[PDB]
Amino acid sequence: AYNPITPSKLIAFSASYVPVRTLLNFLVASQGTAFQTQAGRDSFRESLSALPSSVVDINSRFPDAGFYAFLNGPVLRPIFVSLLSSTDTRNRVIEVVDPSNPTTAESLNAVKRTDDASTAARAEIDNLIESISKGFDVYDRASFEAAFSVVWSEATTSKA
Amino acid sequence: AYNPITPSKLIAFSASYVPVRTLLNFLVASQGTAFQTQAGRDSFRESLSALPSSVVDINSRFPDAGFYAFLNGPVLRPIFVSLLSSTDTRNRVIEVVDPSNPTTAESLNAVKRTDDASTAARAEIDNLIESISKGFDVYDRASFEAAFSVVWSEATTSKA
Amino acid sequence: AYNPITPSKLIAFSASYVPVRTLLNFLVASQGTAFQTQAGRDSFRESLSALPSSVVDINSRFPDAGFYAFLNGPVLRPIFVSLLSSTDTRNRVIEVVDPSNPTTAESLNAVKRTDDASTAARAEIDNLIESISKGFDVYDRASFEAAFSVVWSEATTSKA
């Protein structure tokens, strides 16, 4: 009748608020951000990645159609994870008073660490664009049938 | 009758406000900008790339003709993406008080990083000019037929 | 009858205000400019290249003769593009207080970067002179017939 089958396998903790909406459109404006920097990595973490928290725990999937994508197992298991952490976490302070005097990338840190955060960011953002608008994850009509066993009949003023 | 078919595949989040108008003409004036620099990379991100946000979600494609180009899948998937991020993101501060004293491109950063942002910018801007005025993406008459299934009949004061 | 045929292919965004007039004559006075420098690259960008913006969108090509050249596809796709960006973009500041003390072209930048902007400028300016006064682009009489389909008949006080 109406159930999830094998362990309590749920991952409506990661992504399905997110599919159409906040994914392809915010990805472009937010591709445009403060990266070399400090402020863009910090706030990005915050908006797109920390919230895709679906109201779908179990309480309501009566909207029978499909927009919402159970974006999790396939595409996202590289991206949302490796990328979320891959950009350098927020503590960046090199500067003394004068911007380059002299152990600015000699003795505190080095080139490759800081700079290569910024293009690890780059292509992971795009690989999200093509694949989640098509590739396997979408929770539409015969696919929400696949996760929860769907059979739930009610007739008169059962809907009030 | 009237529908998008396979997942909810939409990318009217990236480009179709943009085709004729803001693309070939702004591309020339905006090819002319502050690049070596700081201020030109920052504001460019802002204008041309961050807004091509089409009013076309689904609410109105009654203007039957074709100007507007669903500039997305083919040409733009290199360009608008690799280029948007490729120019160096906005944090640039080397200078102390005296412009070259002495670890200005010795100890803080190096030649190739800064300089090669500016011509990565160069040819990507032009490759956009030839290809989007011709190459495959345009959403004209039998092409808007291709995305949304088009059949929508109404007779008298249905248009008021 | 009266139309542009295949996508909305237009590039009257790049050059056709420009042909006779501002091209061969300004090219000589403006060949003579501040280049090694800072001020000549900045203002050049501004005048000749940033404006050739034709009033010809579609609103008026009733001046049946041909002077105006749809200078775009053939000659200009090297030149107006590679050259516009090729000269070094405007941020140039090496100097401290004393013009050569000592990392003036040792530690901040190097020889080839700065100097070779100035003769990349050189021969691209001339290759524009010979080719656009003859080579293929000109929008004259049976050539404006070629772009827009030309058939538009009107008799009495249709011209008032």
Place this chain on the structure above:
Amino acid sequence: AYNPITPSKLIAFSASYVPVRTLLNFLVASQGTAFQTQAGRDSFRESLSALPSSVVDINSRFPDAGFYAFLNGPVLRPIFVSLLSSTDTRNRVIEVVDPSNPTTAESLNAVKRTDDASTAARAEIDNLIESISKGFDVYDRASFEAAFSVVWSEATTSKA
């Protein structure tokens, strides 16, 4: 009646969006790209090869004619595969500060690795041009009959 016969043999995952359109025309503009380089190999991967993803899973082949080519088994099994990977994958960074000082192709990498990526690219691009405009793969009229068994009869307002 209407079916694919032996295992679930499908490869409408690789190429059939692609035949006429994006193949012979993009192949020429995209033959012209940044190869020695870094940026051209990276974005090429992205556009032509990563998307030929057909909307044809099974949901719609009612367009009875033939343009679309089930470009897969014969021609493409060398090309789209060996070539997609054959050009050097995107990590290229040799340079220090001064372009040739001294283990630039002595101690980090060697001649043959980098250089021979660029002409492996060369002839594989052309061998695609001649063969896919003729050679065996095309899914036209009696050929779409061959894959799916075709028999599907409907009379009145079955088509609405």
Place this chain on the structure above:
Amino acid sequence: AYNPITPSKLIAFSASYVPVRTLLNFLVASQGTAFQTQAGRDSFRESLSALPSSVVDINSRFPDAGFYAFLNGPVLRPIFVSLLSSTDTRNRVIEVVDPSNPTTAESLNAVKRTDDASTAARAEIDNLIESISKGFDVYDRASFEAAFSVVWSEATTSKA
């Protein structure tokens, strides 16, 4: 009646805008260019080779005469392809500060690679001159009959 016959065999993606016009005349001025160099290989790619994109897809071959040459299968399949890629793709940077100190063609690259790009360029440009002004490809009167089946009759104000 009016059709292309066997697969959808089309190559009006490669060359037929091009025959008389831009081919023998631009070939001479453009034979004269920056080759040893960097800037001439880059812009050449751009102009002559990347655009010969014919407006002839299928929409208009009512100009019954023959100038335009379906320059593709025979002559061009060596030349436009092997040559387009054969000249060295655009990334050239050896120089440090002093033009020959000391691994300038010892440790970074070697003689034969760079130099032999420039005369591979040489004779391929000429072999294009003799052969495409005569050799087999031209789409004139009984030859446009050969590709599209030509039969299309219309009498009165069918031409308006």
Place this chain on the structure above:
Amino acid sequence: AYNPITPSKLIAFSASYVPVRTLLNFLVASQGTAFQTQAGRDSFRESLSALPSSVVDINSRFPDAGFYAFLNGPVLRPIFVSLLSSTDTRNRVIEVVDPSNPTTAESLNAVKRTDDASTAARAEIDNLIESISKGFDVYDRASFEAAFSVVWSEATTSKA
């Protein structure tokens, strides 16, 4: 009556402005030029070879006499081509600060490359002098009859 016969075979793109005038006289002054060098190869390309562009496309060969030579097929197909490219293309920079210290023709380039540009120049210039003042190409009176079919009769104020 009045026509060019077989494909559109034209090569009034290469040489016929040129015959008497600019050929034997400029050949002597221009034999005398900066060759070992840089500046003479660059400007030579420019003047004599890049312009022989005849105003003769088709618009006017009413000057019935013969001076002008359709210098193309026979003599020039070695010379104007092999020579135009044969002299070393313009990028020449060996020097450091001190003219011979020490990899000046050891490690950057070698003897035969540079030096043998200058006498490849030598004898090709002369072989042009004897042969184009006599050898087969000249477009005089019964020879302009040979290319265009010549028959064009007009009587009274047809010439005004």
Place this chain on the structure above:
Amino acid sequence: AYNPITPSKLIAFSASYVPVRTLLNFLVASQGTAFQTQAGRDSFRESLSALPSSVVDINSRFPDAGFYAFLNGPVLRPIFVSLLSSTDTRNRVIEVVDPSNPTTAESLNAVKRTDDASTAARAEIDNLIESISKGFDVYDRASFEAAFSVVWSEATTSKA
């Protein structure tokens, strides 16, 4: 009635997809390939030889005519086997940095091994052309009678 007779003798694992189609035509284009080399032996293996996998296991030989050739026992038992392996398997790497310095075919491998792969390839490709367009293997009408015992009668809507 309807059966294969002696052991389960089947070799519709090797060739019968293949006869007309992919054999004489691909054999010519694919005769033209990268052999001395590395890339041509690798991809050839892949396309023509690794797939001739017939959909004919047993599920459908209702297409009563004969095109398809059970190309196996006679011609192919030399060729498809000895040749498939005979060209040198794909691991080829001699080169150091400089193409011939000095144990390039002295100490790593020797002449006869590498070179004689390439003409073992040569004549085996042709011997396939003459013999499989005529010689004994073809599975046509009274020959498919020979393998499977053919008797299978059905009358009305047994064919639906």
Place this chain on the structure above:
Amino acid sequence: AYNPITPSKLIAFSASYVPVRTLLNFLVASQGTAFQTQAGRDSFRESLSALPSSVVDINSRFPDAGFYAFLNGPVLRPIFVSLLSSTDTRNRVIEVVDPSNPTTAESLNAVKRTDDASTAARAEIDNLIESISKGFDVYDRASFEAAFSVVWSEATTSKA
């Protein structure tokens, strides 16, 4: 009535586009090519030999006359095959930095291999010239009768 008789014997995969046209004329210009070399063997393979692909599969031999020659069984079975492969396949790289230092034809390869590719090329090209303009293969009027059985009668608007 209208048929090919014994197996499905077809070789309109090898040559019959080719007879008059591209054979005797391209054979002379293409006899003149880069052979000792690398570039001429590679592109030759490409043009003349890889395409003679006839549109004649079976779809149209209504052009009753004879020009087209079913150039296959007799003359070509030496030539187009032994020659196509006989010239050395395209991988040629001996050179280090200095053209002859010292195992250039001592330790990497030897004299006879490289040099004798170039005159194997020589006489095979000519033996094609005499024999295919006369010798047995031509598919003219009573010869196209010989391959396909020719009987096909139709009267009124059967030809429209």
Place this chain on the structure above:
Amino acid sequence: AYNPITPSKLIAFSASYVPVRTLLNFLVASQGTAFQTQAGRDSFRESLSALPSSVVDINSRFPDAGFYAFLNGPVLRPIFVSLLSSTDTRNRVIEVVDPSNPTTAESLNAVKRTDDASTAARAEIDNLIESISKGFDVYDRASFEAAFSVVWSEATTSKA
């Protein structure tokens, strides 16, 4: 009436533009050329041998007289063929830096190969001089009668 008789035997692809004109006179000036060398073999190929391409396909032999010689079958089948290829094809590079140090004709190539190209050139050029000004090939008046069957009658303004 007016026809070529047996296969479509044509060789107006090889020589008949050529007879009087370009043959005995260019043969002397061009006997005088750069042979030991590189540049003379390359350009010779180009001029005299690659073009003798007659405008005579079939379109016009109304010039009833005889100058033009169908120089093909008899004399030329040795010469134009064996000689065209016999001189060494254009790749010649032995030299290192110092012209003879030490494997200049020891280890790279040997005496007989290079030197004996130059006198194979010698006597073949002369044997062309005596024989083609007399020996059998000439297409004059009763000889153009021999190839095409000549009968073509027209009276009044059939010649306009």
